[PDB]
Amino acid sequence: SYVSLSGLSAAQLDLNTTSNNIANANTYGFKESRAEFADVYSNSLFTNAKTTPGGGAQASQVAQQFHEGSSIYTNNPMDLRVSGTGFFAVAKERLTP
Amino acid sequence: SYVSLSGLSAAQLDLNTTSNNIANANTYGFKESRAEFADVYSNSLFTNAKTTPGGGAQASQVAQQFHEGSSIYTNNPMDLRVSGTGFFAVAKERLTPQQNELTRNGAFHLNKENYMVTANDEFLLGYQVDPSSGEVSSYEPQPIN
Amino acid sequence: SYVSLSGLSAAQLDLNTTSNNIANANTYGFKESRAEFADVYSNSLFTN
Amino acid sequence: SYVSLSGLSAAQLDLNTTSNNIANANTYGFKESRAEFADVYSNSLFTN
Amino acid sequence: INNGMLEQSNIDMTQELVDLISAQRNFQANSRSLEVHNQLQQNILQI
Amino acid sequence: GENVTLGRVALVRVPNEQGLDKKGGTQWDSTQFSGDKIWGESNKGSFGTINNGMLEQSNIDMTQELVDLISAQRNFQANSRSLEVHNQLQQNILQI
Amino acid sequence: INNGMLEQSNIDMTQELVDLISAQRNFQANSRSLEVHNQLQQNILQI
Amino acid sequence: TLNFGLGSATQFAAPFELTKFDEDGATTGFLTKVDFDENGSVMGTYSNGENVTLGRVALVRVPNEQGLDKKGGTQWDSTQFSGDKIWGESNKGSFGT
Amino acid sequence: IPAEFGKPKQTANIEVGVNLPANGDLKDPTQFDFSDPDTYNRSTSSTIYDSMGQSYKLTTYYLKDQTQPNTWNTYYTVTDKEGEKPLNVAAGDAQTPTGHVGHTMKFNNDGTLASLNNGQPITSVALGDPATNTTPVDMNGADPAQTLNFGLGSATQFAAPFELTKFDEDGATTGFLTKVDFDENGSVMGTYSN
Numbered sequence: 094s095y096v097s098l099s100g101l102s103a104a105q106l107d108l109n110t111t112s113n114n115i116a117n118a119n120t121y122g123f124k125e126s127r128a129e130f131a132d133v134y135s136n137s138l139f140t141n142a143k144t145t146p147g148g149g150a151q152a153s154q155v156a157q158q159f160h161e162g163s164s165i166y167t168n169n170p171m172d173l174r175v176s177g178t179g180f181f182a183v184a185k186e187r188l189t190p
Numbered sequence: 191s192y193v194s195l196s197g198l199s200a201a202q203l204d205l206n207t208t209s210n211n212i213a214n215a216n217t218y219g220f221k222e223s224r225a226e227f228a229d230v231y232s233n234s235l236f237t238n239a240k241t242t243p244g245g246g247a248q249a250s251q252v253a254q255q256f257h258e259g260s261s262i263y264t265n266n267p268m269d270l271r272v273s274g275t276g277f278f279a280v281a282k283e284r285l286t287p288q289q290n291e292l293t294r295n296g297a298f299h300l301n302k303e304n305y306m307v308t309a310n311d312e313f314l315l316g317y318q319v320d321p322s323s324g325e326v327s328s329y330e331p332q333p334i335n
Numbered sequence: 336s337y338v339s340l341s342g343l344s345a346a347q348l349d350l351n352t353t354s355n356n357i358a359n360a361n362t363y364g365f366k367e368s369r370a371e372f373a374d375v376y377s378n379s380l381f382t383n
Numbered sequence: 384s385y386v387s388l389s390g391l392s393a394a395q396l397d398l399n400t401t402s403n404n405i406a407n408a409n410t411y412g413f414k415e416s417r418a419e420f421a422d423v424y425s426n427s428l429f430t431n
Numbered sequence: 432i433n434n435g436m437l438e439q440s441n442i443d444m445t446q447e448l449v450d451l452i453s454a455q456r457n458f459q460a461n462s463r464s465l466e467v468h469n470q471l472q473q474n475i476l477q478i
Numbered sequence: 479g480e481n482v483t484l485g486r487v488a489l490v491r492v493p494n495e496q497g498l499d500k501k502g503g504t505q506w507d508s509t510q511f512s513g514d515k516i517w518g519e520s521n522k523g524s525f526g527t528i529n530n531g532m533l534e535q536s537n538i539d540m541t542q543e544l545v546d547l548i549s550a551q552r553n554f555q556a557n558s559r560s561l562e563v564h565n566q567l568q569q570n571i572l573q574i
Numbered sequence: 575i576n577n578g579m580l581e582q583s584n585i586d587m588t589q590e591l592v593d594l595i596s597a598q599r600n601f602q603a604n605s606r607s608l609e610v611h612n613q614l615q616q617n618i619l620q621i
Numbered sequence: 622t623l624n625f626g627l628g629s630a631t632q633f634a635a636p637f638e639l640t641k642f643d644e645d646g647a648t649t650g651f652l653t654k655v656d657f658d659e660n661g662s663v664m665g666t667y668s669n670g671e672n673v674t675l676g677r678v679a680l681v682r683v684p685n686e687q688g689l690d691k692k693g694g695t696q697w698d699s700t701q702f703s704g705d706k707i708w709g710e711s712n713k714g715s716f717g718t
Numbered sequence: 719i720p721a722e723f724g725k726p727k728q729t730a731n732i733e734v735g736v737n738l739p740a741n742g743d744l745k746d747p748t749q750f751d752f753s754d755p756d757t758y759n760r761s762t763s764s765t766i767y768d769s770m771g772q773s774y775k776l777t778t779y780y781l782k783d784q785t786q787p788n789t790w791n792t793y794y795t796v797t798d799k800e801g802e803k804p805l806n807v808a809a810g811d812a813q814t815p816t817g818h819v820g821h822t823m824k825f826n827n828d829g830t831l832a833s834l835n836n837g838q839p840i841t842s843v844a845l846g847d848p849a850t851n852t853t854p855v856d857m858n859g860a861d862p863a864q865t866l867n868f869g870l871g872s873a874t875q876f877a878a879p880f881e882l883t884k885f886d887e888d889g890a891t892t893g894f895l896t897k898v899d900f901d902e903n904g905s906v907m908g909t910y911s912n
Binding site for chain 6: 194198201205208209212214217218227252257266269271275277278279287291296297312316317331
């Protein structure tokens with residue numbers, strides 16, 4: 094059950110990641126996220142562990158895949174895009190950079 | 191009752207193995223496990239052998255079936271896959287290449303030191319080849335830079 | 336789809352340029368305009 | 384399922400290549416692109 | 432840096448829909464396993 | 479414009495893959511029963527090849543896993559029925 | 575502070591339903607244990 | 622004492638404007654997130670971008686755990702059949718993670 | 719079910735066809751030293767096998783003769799676990815003060831090969847026999863009297879850059895277990911890399 098519950102949780106985490114990706118289909122500058130998982134296996138000195146099964150599925154990390162997104166064209170000079178590698182830098186307060 | 195209890199235990203072990211297989215349906219590099227069982231039989235010079243039943247079911251080993259799994263495509267050069275026989279070698283610590291473990295998933299990236307590491311920030315192992323060399327010059331394992 | 340939308344936009348820009356050329360067939364001193372286009376290819380460290 | 388997904392990806396890649404070709408129908412100096420595919424078969428010690 | 436352009440998201444709707452289907456299938460299978468484990472425990476609890 | 483090779487990935491093979499001990503996070507280590515780690519390049523001898531841009535999923539079959547779930551549940555129920563019969567027999571003896 | 579928004583509850587219906595099932599199972603197991611204790615006491619009280 | 626620099630001050634037709642304000646003061650951090658690594662070290666990040674390790678959790682392993690005496694509240698204490706408390710880090714030697 | 723199956727065959731004939739750059743810089747025959755790349759022009763690496771199936775790396779060095787036009791000096795080296803031990807030709811007409819003996823290649827003005835080793839065949843000294851070579855190859859119990867025959871009858875020198883057009887050898891190391899299947903007779907059959 095705890096292994097099955099871990100499977101449910103992993104599937105729902107992948108669901109949430111996909112839904113977040115789908116929602117942001119129209120936002121400017123968004124980067125998709127990917128959910129990666131790892132197996133669970135652990136034992137102490139007391140347990141034999143020659144014939145013990147797995148411990149389920151554990152969430153490893155939600156990645157932030159940074160492959161270039163497509164461009165729209167507005168014909169407005171105030172709209173800028175970084176073609177290639179780089180980020181714009183924006184400061185909350187004018188004084189402090 | 192002990193033999194029936196053994197049967198329950200064997201069935202529950204098979205259940206746990208199958209559930210662990212199901213839970214890891216999405217993880218990268220996972221290998222399914224198959225649980226094998228063996229009979230239990232042991233008689234003394236002092237039991238009639240033919241008048242004595244068996245002794246139940248004992249768990250033999252949880253296998254680790256290592257058949258190739260399917261591939262997905264991310265179009266990301268940092269993702270690697272071993273088509274065929276082989277494991278990647280990953281080191282817990284950058285300096286030591288002895289403390290290494292074998293893995294099959296290839297979700298790699300570069301960390302702030304420009305080392306190819308896994309999700310756990312475990313450094314991948316590779317061979318040193320010179321910019322003009324051909325085959326492996328030093329066949330010892332050290333982190334890829 | 337953004338590729339197809341880009342193609343639509345390029346064709347429509349050429350349409351507008353041609354229409355401006357045709358409209359001014361009678362004005363004195365006018366010089367025709369030509370629309371030139373370039374391919375798009377984003378070089379990133381990813382995307383092979 | 385993964386094989387079907389691979390087929391979908393192949394079809395979509397051909398779509399993207401063709402759409403890029405069509406979009407650049409007016410650009411000067413453009414060269415068309417052709418998408419070629421290869422089969423997948425894993426040779427392992429298991430799996431008969 | 433190019434003016435007159437904006438970056439959209441870097442997602443593929445096709446892949447997202449397919450992953451939605453796959454994740455639903457995985458969730459359903461795991462819930463089936465959990466139901467099986469509840470049924471086994473209920474079966475023992477009736478002796 | 480300097481295209482220089484920075485290394486090559488190491489590929490590790492053990493003679494007995496069933497005998498590898500299971501660590502956490504989809505990792506294994508070599509043991510007494512797994513033999514010594516055989517270090518080699520890719521595409522050499524019996525080693526496989528390395529493809530970038532891809533990942534390996536699980537090697538499980540949902541159909542087969544679901545069927546094995548059904549069969550294991552059935553075996554569990556049969557064994558519990560046997561245990562119930564034994565308990566009933568003992569109770570029957572204990573009421574003379 | 576963001577205007578125009580509210581915070582909903584921070585509960586997960588899936589996890590809550592699963593915990594409901596698990597807690598019911600624990601309750602049933604403990605009730606089975608109390609039954610055995612009564613049965614044992616009644617068994618003593620019939621000599 | 623305070624040293625003030627106004628070498629770039631100007632007086633034009635434009636209204637009052639504070640074009641630049643730069644200082645070297647630094648008050649403190651503010652705890653923002655806490656995470657533990659596999660070594661048990663606790664790392665905390667602060668508003669000033671100051672990621673400082675605050676310690677690492679102690680792990681105790683006794684040779685005979687069966688001999689531990691049971692206190693209340695899911696706690697155990699060392700005895701002599703349990704041996705002496707071996708203090709160590711995590712992921713070192715025979716300890717876990 | 720052996721992981722490697724085969725009958726290793728020692729390397730005996732090495733046929734090499736190269737094009738040597740005519741526009742490459744001239745080099746000093748007496749100043750040749752395989753530790754210094756700048757003394758020669760080009761270096762190629764090849765793998766050879768002993769009697770027992772051990773793999774060794776063979777590096778070939780080509781040097782452009784400065785004293786004599788359209789003439790080249792070629793040296794061989796065998797790489798073992800202790801270092802790079804030079805391999806000497808018994809009757810090669812290219813000699814160095816360091817005791818490394820190569821062979822000379824001469825070409826015509828139309829770019830074709832003129833002569834090889836003053837018309838004598840290129841046979842090297844025994845690899846692992848210390849009585850014939852000042853740098854014996856450590857063959858780890860294999861046949862120490864193994865010798866190599868080098869064939870370069872199709873080598874050329876044109877304006878084109880250095881090119882290794884053809885490399886042919888008879889060596890055979892071993893197999894590598896690749897697949898296993900059982901027939902209806904119970905016979906277990908295995909296929910290998912070779």
